[PDB]
């Protein structure tokens, strides 16, 4: 299947409280594998996935010094943006970035990313064409003309097509086993009596991984996606995820409904029903 190496960087100016909080987090296939944090004792890149300890003390040194270098630029950027947006030097602001590359099953590039956000609102982003930019507002335009001049679009196109990808292949090679891991869900149905003559049938899927999953309720073979209530997939805290979906059916017609659980870990979708204790 496809793969990807992206970095989620954040810099939060904390006027008064001290220097800006810088936090860089690298993800491979949506799985954190590295992280930096200035607001730490002696800021250094630490592995987040055991398989990263396969990297020598160079990588870390090299990668750490680069993190510190981006940190300072970000410290400057923040000052700059206060200029563009004419904002006081006594308020907290956020600069966020997503920088990465998504490859295909062949090791080629499918799409590279490079988008900024200020205070949680798209600022600038590289176009899929990897040559032109999409400035979100008047401010972003200034960076946009600067980067067109310097030829930033090219510098990144280079990184995205080579270095990025190259490193992606390198990371995968030592994490595939782990990244391809899969934990099937274990589902069950709970019963809850509602006001009047109704009842609620909540279908639970537990300890599944990855988070991706789908649950459905059917009335004699038909997906009741209209009156089905469901929560967003949430973390258990041990690596797995959870999720439930429920519907309100009439008291006595519980056996006319069945739950279906679709997860990539399963050999075949799940099918359950209300199971009153024998």
């Amino acid at each position: 299947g496809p793969h990807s190496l992206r970095y989620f960087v954040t810099a939060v100016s904390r006027p008064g409280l001290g220097e800006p909080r810088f936090i860089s987090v690298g993800y491979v296939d949506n799985t954190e594998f590295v992280r930096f944090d200035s607001d730490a004792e002696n800021p250094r890149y630490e592995p987040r996935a055991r398989w990263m300890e396969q990297e020598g003390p160079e990588y870390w040194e090299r990668e750490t010094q680069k993190a510190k270098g981006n940190e300072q630029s970000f410290r400057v950027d923040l000052r700059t943006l206060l200029g563009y947006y004419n904002q006081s030097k006594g308020g907290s602001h956020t600069i966020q970035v997503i920088s990465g590359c998504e490859v295909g099953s062949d090791g080629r590039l499918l799409r590279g990313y490079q988008q900024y956000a200020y205070d949680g609102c798209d600022y600038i982003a590289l176009n899929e064409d990897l040559k032109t930019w999409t400035a979100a507002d008047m401010a972003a335009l200034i960076t946009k003309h600067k980067w067109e001049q310097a030829g930033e679009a090219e510098r990144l196109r280079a990184y995205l097509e080579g270095t990025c990808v190259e490193w992606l292949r390198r990371y995968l090679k030592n994490g595939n086993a782990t990244l391809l891991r899969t934990d099937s869900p274990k589902a069950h149905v709970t019963h809850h009596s509602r006001p009047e003559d109704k009842v609620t049938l909540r279908c639970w899927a537990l300890g599944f991984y990855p988070a991706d999953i789908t649950l459905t309720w059917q009335l004699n073979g038909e997906e009741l996606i209209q009156d089905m209530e469901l929560v967003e997939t949430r973390p258990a805290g041990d690596g797995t995820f959870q999720k439930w979906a429920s519907v309100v059916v009439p008291l006595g017609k519980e056996q006319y409904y069945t739950c279906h659980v679709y997860h990539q870990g399963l050999p075949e979708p799940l099918t359950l029903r209300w199971e009153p204790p024998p």
Binding site: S24, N70, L81, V97, S99, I124, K146, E152, T163, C164
Partner: peptide
């Protein structure tokens, strides 16, 4: 490995 970011 990450890239070196330019300035806004």
């Amino acid at each position: 490995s990450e890239i070196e970011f330019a300035r806004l």
